[PDB]
Amino acid sequence: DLRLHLLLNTSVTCNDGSPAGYYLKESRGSRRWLLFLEGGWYCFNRENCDSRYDTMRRLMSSRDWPRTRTGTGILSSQPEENPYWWNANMVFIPYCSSDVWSGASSKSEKNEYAFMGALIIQEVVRELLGRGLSGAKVLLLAGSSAGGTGVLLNVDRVAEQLEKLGYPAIQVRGLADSGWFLDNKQYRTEAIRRGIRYWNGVVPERCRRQFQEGEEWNCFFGYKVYPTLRSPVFVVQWLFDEAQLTVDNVHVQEGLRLYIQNLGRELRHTLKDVPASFAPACLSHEIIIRSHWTDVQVKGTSLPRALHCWDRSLHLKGCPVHLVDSCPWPHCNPSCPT
Ligand SMILES: *[C@@H]1O[C@H](CO)[C@@H](O)[C@H](O)[C@H]1NC(C)=O
Ligand SMILES: CCOc1ccc(CC(=O)O)cc1
Numbered sequence: 001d002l003r004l005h006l007l008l009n010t011s012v013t014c015n016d017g018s019p020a021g022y023y024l025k026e027s028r029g030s031r032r033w034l035l036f037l038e039g040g041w042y043c044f045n046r047e048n049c050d051s052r053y054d055t056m057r058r059l060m061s062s063r064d065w066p067r068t069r070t071g072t073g074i075l076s077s078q079p080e081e082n083p084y085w086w087n088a089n090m091v092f093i094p095y096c097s098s099d100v101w102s103g104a105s106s107k108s109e110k111n112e113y114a115f116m117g118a119l120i121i122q123e124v125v126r127e128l129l130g131r132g133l134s135g136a137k138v139l140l141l142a143g144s145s146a147g148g149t150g151v152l153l154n155v156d157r158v159a160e161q162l163e164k165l166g167y168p169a170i171q172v173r174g175l176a177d178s179g180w181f182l183d184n185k186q187y188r189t190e191a192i193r194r195g196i197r198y199w200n201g202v203v204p205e206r207c208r209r210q211f212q213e214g215e216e217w218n219c220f221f222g223y224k225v226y227p228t229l230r231s232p233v234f235v236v237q238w239l240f241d242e243a244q245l246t247v248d249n250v251h252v253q254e255g256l257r258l259y260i261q262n263l264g265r266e267l268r269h270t271l272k273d274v275p276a277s278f279a280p281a282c283l284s285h286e287i288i289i290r291s292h293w294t295d296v297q298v299k300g301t302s303l304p305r306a307l308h309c310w311d312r313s314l315h316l317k318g319c320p321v322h323l324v325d326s327c328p329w330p331h332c333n334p335s336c337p338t
Contacts (some may be wrong), residue, residue, distance in 0.1 A: 018075075038143070041145075075090050075286050183221050204229065234277065235276070299320070
């Protein structure tokens, strides 16, 4: 079980002004720290944030959070469920800012909601340093769905924060799961552009300097922000991700067949120069915190093994790190989730 800690700095808040926080399970004999970012879409104006507050309140407020949570998947402490990092210090950071972890704005006389996702990550890191993170050798910032995109937007800022605070021996790395999207044509980007203005969203500095004022929405797309990052980042992405197909208005005749096959080919192309990646040919929305995350394989290698091979590489015969399916249709890989 991971135990809840609300942030001691109560000015760093969820959407409705309640304190943000994190769930923690310490492993006293470990210098590995895993900080995981939850996902769950976003909201981008008054009316649709009000709608989310009615039926998705836990993603906007800590008032109803439980005192504990169970770690599952890569957050499990059981070796059978988590062959990769079962002995690590485990942190789950709830998503309660509705801003793809990019916001830096407080509730105020002019703002009905606070959007503080970028500051929540920084404040969690700050408070963990006094709980043992100061002795870490590796900090892995991981996340799924909107949290996977949040990894790409925040991993270098965490590295810069620890360097400026005087901790240069901590190696910061990123694991982005199901957060690598294409700004493609629909079968039948504006919402992000509007969100950035509503949230006062921030993007990595090198990416900001390339795209410049008014075009920062580009940095929310993995294949554009990834080449600007300096920290090592491992990318996990289904070739036929269900959230991608949703925004593409896909829910099979020749036209749709070609559309789906072209989506998988384009995704594969964007991963050609991503040396650490795991990209199975499955239609799915499930994520690396599910109990059975060990079951999928690409070319005979599981994701826990690929992540172990990545670890070795950052110090290989039969220990690959670049695993992208080449077959062109969902479930052409027999190990796809059922
Ligand atoms: C609390 O967090 C805010 C936002 O990052 C910061 O400006 C402020 O200085 C913090 N307060 C303390 C006491 O650290
Ligand atoms: C482009 C980044 O924005 C998003 C990323 C992922 C999701 C999917 C989810 O959170 O379940 C939704 C939005």
